[PDB]
Write a structure and sequence with these properties.
2 copies of one chain form a homodimer. With about 160 residues, chain A is of the alpha+beta class. Chain A has a single domain, classed as Hypothetical Protein Pfu-838710-001 (Beta Barrel). Helices cover about 25% and strands about 45% of the residues of chain A. The first copy, chain A, has 4 helices and 8 strands, in the order βαββββαβββαα. Chain A has an 8-stranded antiparallel β-barrel. In chain A, strand 4 and strand 5 (about 70-75) form a beta hairpin. The radius of gyration of chain A is 16 Å and the shape is globular. The interface of A and B includes residues 74 and 85 of A. The complex binds chloride ion (CL) (5 copies). It is classed as structural genomics, unknown function. The entry lists the keywords Dimer, Hypothetical Protein, Structural Genomics, nppsfa, National Project on Protein Structural and Functional Analyses, RIKEN Structural Genomics/Proteomics Initiative, rsgi, unknown function. It forms a dimeric assembly.
Chain lengths: ~160, ~160
């Protein structure tokens, strides 16, 4: 399952720390997500990565109450406009649009997603790949503390809930 | 608008006639369509073309009572299994699965789709591209008659309704 913790951060400072850690810079993604309202605790969105030409349909189901564990179903599509039209024609309503510029860094089984989110602010998502959720969260927190982050820095809300 | 008329035919005979007309053979597609139940008169399916490695999500809205006029929204996806899983998780129920081998031929603005449909039989769809629905049907019928087809040969039912 998807395991991740989100932190409210100062972009410049944390970028410097992540790099000082030796994380490998993967790339920047300029994303635009169109969300469709589903019953709790499910999420549905069509994502367009404007600088890479990639588009995806993504479905998520929150598995915990801290918004740290998710089941994710994601696949690439060749027509994001068509995907958005499809969900509207199926009766789904647009929940909102999240636009962000994401800096991706990798360190072993940990992925850092440093996001500059339009109308929300700057956030860092620390993601880990693991078969055991508990061990995964332990890894995320060891990394977080190495970056000088604490529990008070955590942001439980989803990006679609954070945009003003 | 998609305009097409479907005919019940004898595969070998009509294939001969179509080639006799000088239609250009485009290719054969081994298709597997998984349909999801929508309220009338809408259709939703995920198609896999097993021999070409292509997959699509297709939505249609029947616009007439003879099932000859359709609004179609179709786009390529990279994961048909995921698309099928997605619709199931969104609450849609599988309506059925249509499997067929399609021979595609082209002649000007007309496309011939000769289908050998599992558990249904052999059918020929004659489609035309037009801005004027009526002129389109006129073109289809001139071609149909050139192939020796008549009104009694028409099959109005959709493939998802035809499979046993
Ligand atoms: Cl994400
Ligand atoms: Cl989020
Ligand atoms: Cl996100
Ligand atoms: Cl078709
Ligand atoms: Cl079809």
């Amino acid at each position: 399952m998807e395991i991740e913790v989100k932190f409210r951060v100062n972009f410049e400072d944390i970028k410097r720390k992540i790099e000082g850690l030796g994380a490998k810079f993967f790339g920047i993604e300029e994303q635009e997500d169109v969300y469709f309202e589903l019953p709790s605790p499910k999420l549905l969105r069509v994502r367009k990565i404007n600088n890479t030409g990639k588009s995806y349909i993504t479905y998520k189901e929150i598995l915990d109450k801290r918004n740290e564990e998710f089941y994710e179903l994601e696949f690439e599509v060749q027509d994001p406009e068509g995907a958005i039209e499809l969900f509207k024609r199926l009766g789904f309503k647009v929940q909102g649009v999240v636009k962000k510029r994401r800096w991706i860094y990798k360190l072993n089984n940990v992925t850092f997603e440093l996001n500059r989110v339009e109308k929300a602010g700057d956030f860092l998502d620390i993601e880990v790949i693991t078969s055991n959720p508990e061990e995964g969260k332990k890894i995320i927190w060891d990394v977080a503390r190495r970056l000088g982050l604490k529990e008070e820095d955590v942001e439980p809300k989803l990006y679609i809930e954070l945009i003003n």
